[PDB]
Ligand binder design. Structure first.
Ligand SMILES: CCCCCCCC/C=C\CCCCCCCC(=O)O[C@@H](COC(=O)CCCCCCCCCCCCCCC)COP(=O)([O-])OCC[N+](C)(C)C
Ligand SMILES: O=S1(=O)NCN(C2CC2)c2ccc(F)cc21
Ligand SMILES: C=C(C)[C@H]1CN[C@H](C(=O)O)[C@H]1CC(=O)O
Lengths: 51, 50, 50
């Protein structure tokens, strides 16, 4: 990895949601629901390392 | 910016030039920049490799 | 909470129950919980492996 950054649920400048979304994001991350959603879509058809 | 829609639920990365104009939330994935290069075609060792 | 400080620049992890009281910045370091354990020092017997 060249750098490190991350996605976002970006709201307008001065919105009453950039706090209500991150309490909801961290609630989905402590419960592990952001990993059941990533293993669902980034699953793939499988790929061999082979050695 | 001109308040036409509220959320941006899409892979919209958190950068320095974007944070000044819109409010991102805290991340839900984590990124990096990396090279997508193509794999070689193995070596294919033959059955008469001796 | 009791306003005896202004920043908390520290290894202070961003959890769900901490941001309902203090109100964090946007992360300066990526991590997760992982397991520390002794490196295995002995070697496998392998009485065969000729
Ligand atoms: C130092 C040890 C000395 C021992 C003696 C040595 C003597 C001479 C021995 C071998 C000489 C063979 C000629 C050289 C070939 C060069 C490479 C080649 O072209 O391979 C080709 C094989 O196609 C063949 O020609 C297979 C023939 C094997 C020889 C049979 C053994 C002789 C028996 C011994 C007599 C005892 C019986 C006694 C009474 C008669 C294939 O080309 P490739 O690019 O390599 O592979 C790609 C193909 N692939 C992916 C599909 C696999
Ligand atoms: O763009 S950020 O909000 N701040 C920068 N970083 C860490 C410094 C690597 C990270 C690391 C992981 C992220 F998901 C987000 C960010
Ligand atoms: C060593 C301590 C108490 C700290 C280190 N950072 C974690 C934190 O940010 O709360 C704590 C616990 C841990 O290592 O699991």
């Amino acid at each position: 990895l060249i750098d490190s950054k991350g996605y976002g649920v970006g709201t307008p400048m001065g919105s009453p949601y950039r706090d209500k979304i991150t309490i909801a994001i961290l609630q989905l991350q402590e419960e592990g629901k952001l990993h059941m959603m990533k293993e669902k879509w980034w699953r793939g058809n499988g790929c061999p390392e082979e050695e | 910016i001109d308040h036409k829609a509220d959320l941006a639920v899409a892979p919209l990365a958190i950068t320095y030039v974007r944070e000044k104009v819109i409010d991102f939330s805290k991340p839900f994935m984590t990124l990096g920049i990396s090279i997508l290069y193509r794999k070689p075609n193995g070596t294919n060792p033959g059955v008469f490799s001796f």
